[PDB]
């Protein structure tokens, strides 16, 4: 899920 992407 995109909500897990960092920065």
């Amino acid at each position, epitope marked *: 899920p995109t*909500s*897990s992407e960092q920065i």
Partner: antibody
Amino acid sequence: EVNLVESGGGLVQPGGSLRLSCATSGFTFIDNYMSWVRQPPGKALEWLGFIRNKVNGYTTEYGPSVKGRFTISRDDSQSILYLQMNTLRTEDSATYYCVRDNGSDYRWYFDVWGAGTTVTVSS
Amino acid sequence: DIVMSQSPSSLAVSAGERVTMTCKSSQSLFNSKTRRNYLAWYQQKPGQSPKLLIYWASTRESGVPDRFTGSGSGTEFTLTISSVQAEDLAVYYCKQSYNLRTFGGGTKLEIKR
């Protein structure tokens, strides 16, 4: 303070194309994910898509309604965000908004919005 | 592709009364890694750009009056407003940011008199 200002929104004949800009100031642009949201008159907000930062490969994601027809890009040296609109339809008539897609601490919400630029698609 | 549904479409309320509005998502907006439900609430007053009120389902944005409380998790969320003021006239949109982003159809808050 943080400012976002969309430009390029005008009257365009159906079928033609148009490129919107979002000039920014007040924050480190290169560190952010940026999205575009629109809204037809008296209608609901619609997420158009976003573009990841340099650290994430400048890749993009779109909403079903525009995927394939619109292209989001950016110029980190200028702190400007672009939205290329091709094959315009009447359904494209709307106020287009530029937003900061805050990713820090995994928040993932739109904390800053521009005033919007209006696109009218008619003959 | 997560579908968001809001209800009611529009509600009329008097200054001082409380109001509640719901948002339903077709999929769980909860993230196991981050431990947060990615549902945010936006307030859009007449002629203005939308404004963030609440994120992570129940966290209130800086500067947002305490009478605005968000709650829920999974697929059913709620936006509650205690002691509504006239100034609260606006359309309230929920939005999921679990995967991509999707806006609800919005709830139009009208002021009774």
